[PDB]
From Swiss-Prot, chain B:
Phosphoserine found at: S127
Pfam families, alphabetized: Ribosomal_S7
Family designation: Belongs to the universal ribosomal protein uS7 family.
Known function: Component of the small ribosomal subunit. The ribosome is a large ribonucleoprotein complex responsible for the synthesis of proteins in the cell. Part of the small subunit (SSU) processome, first precursor of the small eukaryotic ribosomal subunit. During the assembly of the SSU processome in the nucleolus, many ribosome biogenesis factors, an RNA chaperone and ribosomal proteins associate with the nascent pre-rRNA and work in concert to generate RNA folding, modifications, rearrangements and cleavage as well as targeted degradation of pre-ribosomal RNA by the RNA exosome.
Cytoplasm found in the keyword field: yes
Oligomer status and interactors: Component of the small ribosomal subunit. Part of the small subunit (SSU) processome, composed of more than 70 proteins and the RNA chaperone small nucleolar RNA (snoRNA) U3.
Molecular functions (GO terms): mRNA binding; RNA binding; rRNA binding; structural constituent of ribosome
Gene of this entry: RPS5
Designated name of the protein: Small ribosomal subunit protein uS7
Covalent link location (Glycyl lysine isopeptide (Lys-Gly) (interchain with G-Cter in SUMO2)): K32
Keywords associated with the record: Acetylation, Cytoplasm, Isopeptide bond, Nucleus, Phosphoprotein, Ribonucleoprotein, Ribosomal protein, Ubl conjugation
Subcellular location: Cytoplasm; Nucleus, Nucleolus
Swiss-Prot record, chain E:
Job description of the protein: Component of the small ribosomal subunit. The ribosome is a large ribonucleoprotein complex responsible for the synthesis of proteins in the cell. Part of the small subunit (SSU) processome, first precursor of the small eukaryotic ribosomal subunit. During the assembly of the SSU processome in the nucleolus, many ribosome biogenesis factors, an RNA chaperone and ribosomal proteins associate with the nascent pre-rRNA and work in concert to generate RNA folding, modifications, rearrangements and cleavage as well as targeted degradation of pre-ribosomal RNA by the RNA exosome.
Main location class: cytoplasm
Protein name: Small ribosomal subunit protein uS9
Record-linked InterPro entries: Ribosomal_Su5_D2-typ_SF (IPR020568), Ribosomal_uS9 (IPR000754), Ribosomal_uS9_CS (IPR020574), Ribsml_uS5_D2-typ_fold_subgr (IPR014721)
Family label: Belongs to the universal ribosomal protein uS9 family.
Keywords for this protein: Acetylation, Cytoplasm, Nucleus, Phosphoprotein, Ribonucleoprotein, Ribosomal protein
Localization terms from the record: Cytoplasm; Nucleus, Nucleolus
Swiss-Prot record, chain F:
Linked pathology: Diamond-Blackfan anemia 1: A form of Diamond-Blackfan anemia, a congenital non-regenerative hypoplastic anemia that usually presents early in infancy. Diamond-Blackfan anemia is characterized by a moderate to severe macrocytic anemia, erythroblastopenia, and an increased risk of developing leukemia. 30 to 40% of Diamond-Blackfan anemia patients present with short stature and congenital anomalies, the most frequent being craniofacial (Pierre-Robin syndrome and cleft palate), thumb and urogenital anomalies.
Organism in which the protein naturally occurs: Homo sapiens (Human)
Chain positions with N6-acetyllysine modification: K20, K108, K112
Effect of R98H: In DBA1; increased protein degradation; affects assembly into a functional ribosomal subunit
Protein family: Belongs to the eukaryotic ribosomal protein eS19 family.
Alphabetical list of Gene3D superfamilies matching this protein: Winged helix-like DNA-binding domain superfamily/Winged helix DNA-binding domain (1.10.10.10)
Name of the protein: Small ribosomal subunit protein eS19
Keyword set, alphabetical order: Acetylation, Cytoplasm, Diamond-Blackfan anemia, Disease variant, Host-virus interaction, Methylation, Nucleus, Ribonucleoprotein, Ribosomal protein
Effect of A58E: In DBA1; does not localize to the nucleolus; affects assembly into a functional ribosomal subunit
UniProt GO cellular component terms: cytoplasm; cytosol; cytosolic ribosome; cytosolic small ribosomal subunit; extracellular exosome; focal adhesion; membrane; nucleolus
GO molecular function, one term: fibroblast growth factor binding
Positions carrying Omega-N-methylarginine: R64
From Swiss-Prot, chain G:
Gene Ontology BP terms: apoptotic process; base-excision repair; cell division; cellular response to hydrogen peroxide; cellular response to reactive oxygen species; cellular response to tumor necrosis factor; chromosome segregation; cytoplasmic translation
Record gene name: RPS3
Organism phylogeny: Eukaryota, Metazoa, Chordata, Craniata, Vertebrata
Species this protein is from: Homo sapiens (Human)
Protein name: Small ribosomal subunit protein uS3
EC number per UniProt: 4.2.99.18
NCBIfam families on file: PRK04191.1, uS3_euk_arch
RNA sequence: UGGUGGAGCGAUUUGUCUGGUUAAUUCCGAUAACGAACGAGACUCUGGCAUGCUAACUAGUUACGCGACCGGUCGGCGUAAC
């Protein structure tokens, strides 16, 4: 029951905000002590490569960005309740990692 | 009251010609403690007219490749120069600066109308802003150039240049170039 | 005999003066809201050089603060803003005491109960919100509340059955009961969206005005039409004189002061002597407030100026 | 320079001749009613329409717009 | 009893904490006169000379500076001090006194209250800087 | 009066003079010969540089705690000029920083931290704050 | 030991990409439209969207549990952690890839380029697309490379909307003379609140609700409740 | 750049324009054309503002306690309002 934390990590913002909000309101209605979403610095993966395969042109470059948005929600609740509240909330395009102490 | 480097007053300074009276800023409402303002005075047209003339001097001082963004050093060059000026002549340096810019500004320039290779120029009038621009540019190039490879420093070279320029001495680079530009306008007409 | 004269013009706010609020307790203190997201408290020095001086400015209401009102004691203040939240201010120090966070869209009007224990607030939500003192939402009415926006909501100050009045942009002036929240009257006279509804100082007459520019008088005791007062342009504000027994509305560039036994033109307030900005449209009068003693009128204009109109008796 | 495109013009016009009685002279009221009136794609587009609606509502009193 | 505001230039940020006291002036625990770029010492003395020490009498301000470069920090701290004073003379004094301060500060230099918004522009491929391009050789 | 209240240039010269006068600072055998970094072209001009470096090191360790040999090597770094190759940031000498910290440990002015770094001792804080006292007194 | 979030999200990207490339080269003949992968620590499910599922399953669901044994043997996750599901495509007309594959396998049937491409246009416009663009390039006739573009309805080229309003497919057809390039571009319908097409409208579109005819009252009357 | 209409046996042309106006075939207004479609614009990402909102021992401040050194300095440590 002690200090389970839940790390929600995704590339989409909307889906991550929706699922995390659902976990929070799902926990709040049960009268459980919850520490709110801790938004960490957004990880931006940059790749800059030549457009051309051959290498004859005006030396143009692509700029490929990949965004990683990470949220932490913390609970002071029993593991039995934590298991089912973590079980019910599934979404394609979010990764959830639960840790205790 | 407000005094330049907290030791030079801006009330005892006096403008000669009415033409430049609204194109040399140094006066009651433009009185600043340091040249260094970091304003947006080159944002649009006729905004640099409201730039303090001391700031225009120290900005046009950091010109050549090695000193492009080395303002903090031009401010102390101008500070030392102003002290040298006061020691040599006796009176307010800001008056000497204004006198130098008043004298140094070319009144009639020559414009290119024709083809390239051949020289054919029409003599035309110079705007009060362009007079101030060329005056500052000529003073700095004279200072710079004069002290490039010899022992006297930039500070006392700038002082010497402004002493000569203010009292219209033939030795000043700025006076020689003005004289030549007006003589070329006189040659065309 | 009794004509209005411009005594001075307080200049503080930097935007449209949306609402002015006064109290009988403090006669040297008025509280005016504006479109610079600021509510300024005035010290009425009544000097020759200027009538008032900016004293304290409440800040933090993000978007335009539309309505402002203060309690019976000169200690609290309530406001409703376009950010969609109400703020209850501590007037002494000038800090927010409580935040009501319920509405969705822009809050247009708020009202303070006579006993100072109940709050009613109208928005663009198509709903009225009943808040209590501590600040939790009590009752959100959605039983055909309004088809369009709710422009003005007010209380009826009397010892009789306490009732609230609510006009909207659906042409309806609707009357609710607190603790019951059912309709007694839905009045249908106007032809145009409504801006203001004001109750009498006694608490017997209701005055509704808007785009139509024809102020219509009802009676709360029966629920029937009495008069149709024919105004000029759009009515921005109605207010009853607490002593003189007059009705003062707001035409766009002028303020009309009228008698209720004569039904005649008593006065016309227009301040335009210079013709420098005569090519442009005149500056609109938005807010109307009365002084403590009911001898003076406070007019809020869209040119960022609050004017005082002193009744010069002979 | 900045010229209002056929999109904001067309939209603004049909808004006037549908909800003339709803609109007035103030930009912010027209901006707020334009949200409720039309399903509009973005804030900028709504601001530009609200602005040109304001501009038309000025000159409608001056004379009859074609 | 106290207020806390930030002055910002480029990526420099200087947060001034203003409380009541004996006219104390400290930035990162150091006096103004002991700040490293002494050439621009007057730029820090701008707000205190313009208003006069008498206004600072009943005010202790503690400034902390982070990010940016030397001169940017100087513009952040000198902005922060003035914004802190006007914020304090807004909250715990009449608005008239705040106006009497504001008008003087704005009339001298608008930079003291309003932040310079421009930032270091993004660099593009095909050149060394944001505008400049590499040398283009014909034959 | 505190180290932060005085000028940080004069303070080092005063503390260096104190460290010389004490006459119990273990100077290495190679002070006359060795440079002070990878990127310096000549040996330092002043004969008593070890005392000024020791003084500087103590002052740095006063201003923030938990400073190792690597940090001290990062403090006294500068611009390596590589002839025709462009100039890059080069770090200081590790030995000089280590011998200075060893020599100051010798005075019981600095001691090792449980966390891993080196902090100034209350004896050190006394000496440094005293030196600041008379440096302030000399104006 | 576990890998970083950055490397993990990349790894999932390559997994998706390689799986797609494998599935395309396997189920091209059965009009493989797309794939959807949902991952659960209990067991990860792979969902294949193809034109004719009856075929991709195989004789009594034989081929599906060849494909299952492949991905299990290859990627190295444990057996009983994957079930390859084959769901039917909602509308095969508004899938660029499906139409591109159909055009490729009817061209391999030895049909004229004009009739084949027009057949695909007619079907895509019949299915209910906003507009279609079919391009075929290479040795169409003779020894010189040529290109034939065929367009119908509305087709947008610039801005963000292109990303989520038009879907494209690029396919290589092997002929005896050489190789032909098929480019199929389909603009979808508004489809509010649906799976067919995008939810948000185009950002240059302004929809205005019709006013209700309000009867203006002349005589004042007050209805009592 | 089509559709239908107009002008030429025809290739073709008009629409797609005299004149103002815009960064813009961008608009206004003329009008044998009228209705449209792509590009432009809209759009998406990024900079600049919020002492308003939701939050935070993997971010900090303010206050208090204890300590080190002379009411002051601390990126010396531990709790509470945010």
């Amino acid at each position: 029951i002690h200090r389970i934390r839940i790390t929600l990590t995704s590339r989409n913002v909307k889906s991550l905000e929706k699922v995390c909000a659902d976990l929070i309101r799902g926990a709040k209605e049960k009268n459980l002590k919850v520490k709110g979403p801790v938004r960490m610095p957004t990880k931006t993966l940059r790749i800059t490569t030549r457009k051309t395969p051959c290498g004859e042109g005006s030396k143009t470059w692509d700029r490929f960005q990949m965004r990683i948005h990470k949220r932490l929600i913390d609970l002071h609740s029993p593991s039995e309740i934590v298991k089912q509240i973590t079980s019910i909330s599934i979404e394609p395009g979010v990764e959830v990692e639960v840790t205790i102490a | 009251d407000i005094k330049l480097f907290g030791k030079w007053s801006t009330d005892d300074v006096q403008i000669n010609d009415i033409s430049l009276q609204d194109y040399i800023a140094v006066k009651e409402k433009y009185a600043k403690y340091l040249p260094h303002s970091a304003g947006r005075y080159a944002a649009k047209r006729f905004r640099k007219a409201q730039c303090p003339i001391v700031e225009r001097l120290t900005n046009s001082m950091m010109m050549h490749g090695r000193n492009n963004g080395k303002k903090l050093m031009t401010v102390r060059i101008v500070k030392h120069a102003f002290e040298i000026i006061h020691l040599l002549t006796g009176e307010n340096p800001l008056q000497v600066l204004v006198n130098a810019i008043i004298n140094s500004g070319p009144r009639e320039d020559s414009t290119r109308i024709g083809r390239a290779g051949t020289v054919r120029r029409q003599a035309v009038d110079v705007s009060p802003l362009r007079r101030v621009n060329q005056a500052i540019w000529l003073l700095c190039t004279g200072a710079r150039e004069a002290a490039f490879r010899n022992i006297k420093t930039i500070a006392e070279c700038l002082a010497d240049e402004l002493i000569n320029a203010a009292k219209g001495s033939s030795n000043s680079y700025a006076i020689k170039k003005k004289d030549e530009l007006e003589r070329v306008a006189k040659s065309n007409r | 005999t009794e004509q209005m004269t411009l005594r001075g013009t307080l200049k503080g706010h930097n935007g449209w003066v949306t609402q002015i609020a006064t109290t009988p307790q403090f006669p040297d203190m008025i509280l005016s809201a504006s479109r610079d997201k600021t509510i300024i408290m005035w010290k009425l020095t009544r000097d020759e050089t200027n009538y008032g001086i900016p004293q304290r400015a409440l800040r933090g209401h993000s978007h335009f603060v539309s309505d402002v009102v203060i309690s019976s004691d000169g200690q609290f203040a309530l406001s409703g803003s376009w950010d969609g939240t109400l703020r209850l201010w501590d007037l002494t120090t000038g800090t927010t005491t409580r935040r009501f966070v319920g509405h969705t869209k822009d809050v247009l009007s708020v009202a303070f109960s006579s006993d100072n224990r109940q709050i009613v607030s109208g928005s663009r939500d198509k709903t009225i919100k009943l808040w209590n003192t501590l600040g939790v939402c009590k009752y959100t009415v959605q039983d055909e509340s309004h088809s369009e926006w709710v422009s003005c909501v007010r209380f009826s100050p009397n010892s009789s059955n306490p009732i609230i009045v609510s006009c909207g942009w659906d042409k309806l002036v609707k009357v609710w009961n607190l603790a019951n929240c059912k309709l007694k009257t839905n009045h249908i006279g106007h032809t145009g969206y409504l801006n203001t509804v004001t109750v009498s100082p006694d608490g017997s007459l209701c005055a509704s005005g808007g785009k139509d520019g024809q102020a219509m008088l009802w009676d709360l005791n029966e629920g029937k039409h009495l008069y149709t007062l024919d105004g000029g342009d759009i009515i921005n504000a109605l207010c009853f004189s607490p002593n003189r027994y007059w009705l003062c509305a707001a035409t766009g560039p002028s303020i009309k002061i009228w008698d209720l036994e004569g039904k005649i033109i008593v006065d016309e307030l227009k301040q335009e002597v210079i013709s420098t900005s005569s090519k442009a449209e005149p500056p609109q009068c938005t807010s109307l407030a009365w002084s403590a003693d009911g001898q003076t009128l406070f007019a809020g204009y869209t040119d960022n100026l609050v004017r005082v109109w002193q009744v010069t008796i002979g | 320079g900045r010229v209002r495109t056929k999109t904001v013009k067309k939209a603004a016009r049909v808004i006037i001749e549908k909800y003339y009685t709803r609109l007035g002279n103030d930009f912010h009221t027209n901006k707020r009613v334009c949200e409720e009136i039309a399903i509009i794609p973005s804030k900028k587009l709504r601001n530009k329409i609200a602005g040109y609606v304001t501009h038309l509502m000025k000159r409608i009193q001056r004379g009859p717009v074609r | 009893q106290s207020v806390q505001v930030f002055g910002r230039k480029k990526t420099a940020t200087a947060v001034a904490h203003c409380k009541r006291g004996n006219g104390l002036i400290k930035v990162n625990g150091r006096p103004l006169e002991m700040i490293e770029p002494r050439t621009l010492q007057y730029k820090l003395l701008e707000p205190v000379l313009l208003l006069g020490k008498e206004r600072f009498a009943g005010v202790d301000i503690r400034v902390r500076v982070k990010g940016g470069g030397h001169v940017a920090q100087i513009y952040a701290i000198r902005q922060s001090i003035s914004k802190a004073l006007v914020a304090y003379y807004q909250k715990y004094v009449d608005e008239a006194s705040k106006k009497e301060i504001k008008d003087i500060l704005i009339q001298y230099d608008r930079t003291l209250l309003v932040a310079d918004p421009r930032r270091c522009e993004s660099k593009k491929f095909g050149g060394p800087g944001a505008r400049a391009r590499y040398q283009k050789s014909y034959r | 009066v505190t180290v932060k209240d005085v000028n940080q240039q004069e303070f080092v010269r005063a503390l260096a003079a104190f460290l010389k006068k004490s006459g119990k600072l273990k100077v290495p055998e190679w002070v006359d010969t060795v440079k002070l970094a990878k990127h310096k072209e000549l040996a330092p001009y002043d004969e008593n540089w070890f005392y000024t470096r020791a003084a500087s090191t103590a002052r740095h360790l006063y201003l923030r705690g938990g400073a190792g040999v690597g940090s001290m090597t990062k403090i006294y770094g500068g611009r390596q000029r590589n002839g025709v190759m462009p100039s890059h940031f080069s770090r200081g000498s590790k030995s000089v920083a280590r011998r200075v910290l060893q020599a100051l440990e010798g005075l019981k002015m600095v001691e090792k931290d449980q966390d891993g770094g080196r902090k100034l001792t209350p004896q050190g804080q006394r000496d440094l704050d005293r030196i600041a006292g008379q440096v302030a007194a000399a104006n | 030991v576990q890998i970083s979030k950055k490397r993990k999200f990349v790894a999932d990207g390559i997994f998706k990409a390689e799986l797609n490339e494998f599935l395309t080269r396997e189920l091209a003949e059965d009009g493989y439209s797309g794939v959807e992968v949902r991952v659960t620590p209990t067991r990860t499910e792979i969902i294949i969207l193809a034109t004719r599922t009856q075929n991709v399953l195989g004789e009594k669901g034989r081929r599906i549990r060849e494909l299952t044994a492949v991905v299990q043997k290859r990627f190295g996750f444990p057996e009983g952690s994957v079930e390859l599901y084959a769901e039917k495509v909602a509308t095969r007309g508004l899938c660029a890839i499906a139409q591109a594959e159909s055009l490729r396998y009817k061209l391999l049937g030895g049909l004229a380029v004009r009739r084949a491409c027009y057949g695909v246009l007619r079907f895509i416009m019949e299915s209910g697309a906003k507009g279609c663009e079919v391009v075929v390039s290479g040795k169409l006739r003779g020894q010189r490379a040529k290109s034939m573009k065929f367009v119908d309805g509305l087709m947008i080229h610039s801005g963000d909307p292109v990303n989520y309003y038009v879907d494209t497919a690029v396919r290589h057809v092997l002929l005896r003379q050489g190789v032909l390039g098929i480019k199929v571009k389909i603009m979808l319908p508004w489809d509010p609140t649906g799976k067919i097409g995008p939810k948000k409208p185009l950002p240059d579109h302004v929809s205005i609700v019709e006013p209700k005819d309000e009867i203006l009252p002349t005589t004042p009357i007050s209805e009592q409740k």
